[PDB]
């Protein structure tokens, strides 16, 4: 009968769908590799999917995945054991070298554009009309690090025009240079902004950006990488 025809068909459909559904989720990171870079013997049971191509909003091009995968950077790590499976120790300073929770990917060194071709993220100073509407305004507050010492002061708020959203605080250091610090990693309080991930002495190390009114995808990654990494690597100076 019908019902049992229907339910039996359904399971076959479902298995095709999982098959689908999995190969589609292979467009990045595959083929698997060995701790050295060479392709792994078992790639498992699902084949790699046929390639597909995105175009690329503003003359920016094309992307095709699956495609040759490569870190386009040196990785400073060394094995700690003679067999597959263990941690790879950092061979220098993981915050600088960009490994572990401090990693970044080599994304494109252009900034994201909104729907009209304009830089998605501008500092507030250059964003006409943008003002703070609710919540304490950080501009002006001193910035404190996880070692309870003062690293700098906020001088602007870099915002996402199209999403109308704060994305970074720009921060001025002892020497008069600035840094970006992610909104998501700071705590705005009433008489100051607080940063748990970094200690005072690590602010100078935050990657700088090249032009002072835009950030690239590559630089957002180095900045965010560098500061998440502090949670692990700055623990010795973090106190409470």
């Amino acid at each position: 009968d019908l019902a049992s025809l229907a339910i039996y068909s359904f399971w076959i459909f479902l298995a095709g769908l999982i098959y689908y559904l999995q190969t589609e989720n292979m467009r990045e990171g595959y083929p698997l590799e060995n701790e050295d870079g060479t392709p792994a013997a078992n790639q498992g049971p699902f084949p790699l999917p046929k390639p597909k191509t995105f175009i690329l909003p503003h003359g920016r091009g094309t992307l095709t995945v699956p495609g040759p995968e490569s870190e386009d950077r040196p990785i400073a790590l060394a094995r700690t054991a003679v067999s597959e499976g263990f941690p790879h120790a950092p061979t220098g300073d993981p915050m600088k070298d960009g490994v572990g929770p401090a990693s970044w990917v080599a994304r494109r060194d252009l900034p994201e554009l909104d729907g009209h071709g304009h830089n998605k993220i501008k500092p507030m100073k250059a964003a006409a009309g943008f003002h703070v509407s609710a919540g304490k305004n950080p501009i002006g507050l001193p910035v404190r690090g996880c070692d309870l010492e003062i690293a700098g002061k906020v001088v602007d708020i870099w915002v996402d025009i199209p999403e109308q959203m704060a994305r970074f605080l720009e921060v001025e250091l002892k020497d008069g240079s600035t840094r970006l610090l992610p909104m998501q990693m700071v705590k705005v309080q009433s008489n100051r902004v607080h940063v748990n991930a970094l200690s005072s002495d690590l602010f100078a190390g935050i990657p700088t950006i090249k032009s002072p009114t835009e950030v690239t995808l590559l630089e957002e990654d180095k900045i965010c990488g560098y500061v998440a990494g502090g949670l692990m690597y700055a623990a010795p100076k973090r106190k409470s």
Binding site: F10, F54, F130, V132, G135, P162, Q164, D221
Partner: protein, 302 residues
């Protein structure tokens, strides 16, 4: 301690945004409404603009007609007094025509003519909103995903008040419009078909409905967990993978042995959800047309 990103800790306002144009008839968008600072802590503060247009107004007008049609009835059931209307709100109910009238449109209003009227209005209201769903995407040159997914919901609905009644021989099979009464109809439906817990589709629907809650928790918590690297910016993470997406994949790979991509997860999401009403509608459609009793069927298997 650390911020968690559930509410914004600072809002930021700029000019109302009138959105993209692509091929859209700008003549049909309203003005931008106010800015809610309330909404503004969770997501975007901007209300409006909306885009009305023939189909939107068609839809919306029927929408109310169905709504009010039921509402007249309730008023009548109360015998017109407010105190009563409020008192028994959840107890009123507008019920389909009695079995006696089959599939005809001949039943008196009080014997179900109203029911048909309201249904009619809901029918046009819904499909008109469906098309609007497609049209609104064509103008922006977007894929038709939202329309395809909305069809799945429409499926269940269509099965419950239209298809199954047609195949059974009478509108009396359809759902009555009422808060407590549609609840009762539901309970009743399972009892008379031998307990829906025996319906293999019914229980596959549960799986997807539980599934969706589990997947959205998974997803949403993941995007919050990597929003300190820009995670919510999913389309650009699709075009140019960043450490947000890498750490997201790897948390899951290290946890349960496999993972997804930024575009792949959305594919899992759109299907987990869509299958809730798809199997669910087969589930109901085979009930009492082909299977009278899920207990019995399950002993045989046909």
């Amino acid at each position: 301690a650390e911020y968690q990103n559930i509410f914004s800790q600072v809002q930021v306002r700029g000019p109302a945004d009138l959105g993209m144009t692509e091929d859209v008839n700008l003549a049909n968008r309203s003005g931008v409404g106010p800015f809610s600072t309330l909404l503004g802590w969770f997501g975007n503060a901007q209300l409006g603009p909306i885009y009305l247009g023939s189909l939107g107004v068609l839809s919306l007008f029927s929408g109310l007609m169905w709504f009010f049609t039921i509402g007249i009835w309730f008023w009548y059931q109360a015998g017109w007094n407010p105190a009563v209307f409020l008192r028994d709100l959840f107890f009123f109910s507008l019920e389909p025509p009695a079995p006696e009238y089959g599939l005809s449109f001949a039943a008196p209003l009080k014997e179900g003519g109203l029911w048909l009227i309201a249904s009619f209005f809901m029918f046009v209201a819904v499909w008109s909103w469906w098309g609007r769903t497609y049209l609104r995407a064509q103008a922006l040159g977007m894929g038709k995903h939202t329309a395809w997914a909305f069809l799945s919901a429409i499926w269940l609905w269509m099965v419950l008040g239209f298809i199954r009644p047609i195949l059974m021989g009478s509108w009396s099979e359809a759902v009555p419009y009422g808060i407590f009464s549609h609840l009762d109809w539901t309970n009743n439906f399972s009892l008379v078909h031998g307990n829906l817990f025996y319906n293999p589709f019914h229980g596959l629907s549960i799986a997807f409905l539980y599934g969706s809650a589990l997947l959205f928790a998974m997803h949403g918590a993941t995007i919050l967990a990597v929003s300190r690297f820009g995670g919510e910016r999913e389309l650009e993470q699709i075009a140019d993978r960043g450490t947000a997406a890498e750490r997201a994949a790897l948390f899951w790979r290290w946890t349960m042995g496999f993972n997804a991509t930024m575009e792949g997860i959305h594919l899992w999401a759109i299907w987990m959800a869509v299958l809730v009403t798809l199997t669910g509608g087969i589930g109901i459609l085979l009930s009492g047309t082909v299977v009278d009793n899920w207990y019995v069927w399950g002993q045989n298997h046909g």
